[PDB]
């Protein structure tokens, strides 16, 4: 069993996203920039390591890669590989814009090709099942598009950013209804319950991407997106004891992405002087939660129960 | 069986909402203000009575309250208790702003807490069933958020109003697909058919809330919301003979809310000189329908077919 | 069995829509106007012929008309009759505005009445089944509303156009979730697979209607709509070998509508200097695909495989 679960790519993801959030506090709080760099740096480091390990998985464990790619539920986790890359590229845009652009384009093309080749195959049916409607399905169809849009906007391709952001947003709106209906009816097996954190991502990631493409302007759409994001955040906070029914696990990093985005957009909402108190609370809460996740990850690594 | 069905809270609700609509005609038609007050007054009175009776239900019929709260379908009707309260507070804002603000905040906190504790609990699964997808589910997740947004906007907290309005709008867009699919597939049981009126509420209530948050400015979003609201209104008018297949009943008050909002937004569309003829038609039709509902309720009360 | 399958109305539709697209290149490429006229003319002619045939079907094959109207899946194809009419009227607006207005109003009233009488009937349940969720359901509830909105905007009733466009857009985003879930779960029978082309229509048609109601202004909404439309175009391009698994057929004209709109909106995006390269690519691709469809139709007609 390849010691590298694909979902672990959420570790370099949530950190990387969080780094970007701190990057938006460069002017207001100088130390923030330093902090961001640290996150960025470590995130990049971790990402690179995972990529290497994943490369190994492809060379000597290709049967597992094929099995997960053809699976109707696990394939979505592969979408973490391009997403993180884009985010990592975004980080590297602060030092080497050329390498950042190359990574962003590679990740965008990769995620678009993956979604076209796999998310579109599900329409053929016969492999996807009503029990395969999971939050992780957001990653290829929703999260990847938002990440591509934000990364392209950071490069300056604002129109292409609008295109990718709209694709991701409408895909989110089109998938979430059936996902929530499935959760209400059948809910989710305990071992996938951690992935419920992904349900938090679309509402916030979206606005973050939006706030990255429209030059950080706070308008009605961003406020609406925060409305729904906070609704989902309260819903998941209520369910958190149920999510960890069998105890804490690395899968909780599924939350981090959304939480990270909740920080990112918060910075914008602080810059635009729109709900400054709520923005401060969201930023502090996201940082605290991601710090607790990092501490839990360090404890798991120390105890030796991090790799499967 | 406590003589007080929770759905009866739609009576003080539909009137109260309608009152607010008339309050928007104070400048254009002085007598309108007087009419609004009457509605407001009576609505408030009715609400208070029901609250008292509901308190009785809590003190001496707590088993029924627990049963309805734990039910996957009836719990939604409890959301009428905060909603109505908020609306009543809105009315009181024309006389005592402080009491109105206190009531609005109490109702907003109550509905948010109820949605967090219960609507998010359905994601645990095992109690919600495919046959429990009813229009009444709009009340906790959709109607409550729109009412809170409108009330907060009336108080002046416009940004928090956008947050709540967006939460409600996205929740509506996310729940309506599965609800309409269930209605198409499985025929709603006759005794629940009256609740089909709630399907009319989100399309109009939404825009009303929007028109209360953006200072009554008529833009593309409001026109789109009326587009879908009129589509649903025609759809339900076609189905009305089927909705009352087994005869008229107090449950038809489920329509009133939406109809009331149909009047409210209409006033704004009349002020903005956008579709003045359609605005007049919508206002007159909603007022006539609510008047017929009031006459039917009076007839039921006189005939002793109002209370269980 | 009547010789003109209702779905064949997509032939005069797809051409007609395409004609409108070319009509937007009158100022930039004079020959374009001529080309548009040609298409318009032929489209109109074809439409008229089909109308006559359908009249015949009503006079001497009313049993088949009743069967298709009462069917939960085939009824949607009847919605092509008003839609096409409206489009034909649009074409005639370049020569005789009065006849164009009469046709547009007749088509709008007809499609609205049809959707009210039938699409709202499905809510009763017992006739619509989970296996009856097909892309063709877009035609009465979504495509008709967008076509009516665009036609009314062309006449100058921009507010009524906004109403119809919003109705269509909200119906689209409320139906597509369950449709895509059904496609993922239960697939689609091969003889209906061609109708999956309709899945391409709403993302593009929508924006086209929008770009026809807002005077061709390119804003965030249109770019988002293209984002989703291009996502769907890629998804369907990937599936095209599977869509024609049993071979090419006239049903592929289901694509043309969407493709036609993809050209139409493209012209607007070219005028607004927004993604000019992508606009040119989309226009050329739509024209090439519709030309291939026309060639295939001519080949089928010559070989005698066109009429059933």
Residue numbers in the entry:
A (entry chain A), B (entry chain C), C (entry chain B): 6 to 313
From the paper:
We successfully elucidated the structures of all four samples with an average resolution of 3 Å. The HiTehA purified using GDN achieved the highest resolution of 2.9 Å, followed by those purified with DDM and LMNG at resolutions of 3.1 Å, and OG at 3.2 Å, as detailed in Table 1 and Figure S1. The four structures of HiTehA closely align, revealing a minimal root-mean-square deviation (r.m.s.d.) of 0.13 Å for all atoms, except for the sample purified in DDM, which showed a slightly higher deviation of 0.26 Å. This discrepancy may be attributed to distinct folding patterns in the intracellular loops between TM6 and TM7. In general, the structural integrity of the trimeric arrangement remains unaffected using four different detergents during protein purification. Remarkably, none of the detergents tested appear to induce any significant alteration in the position of the gating Phe262 located on TM9. This observation underscores the robustness of the trimeric structure and the stability of key functional elements within HiTehA, even under varying detergent conditions. The identification of a linear density within the channel cavity across all detergent conditions suggests this cavity can be occupied either by detergent molecules or by other hydrophobic molecules such as co-purified lipids.
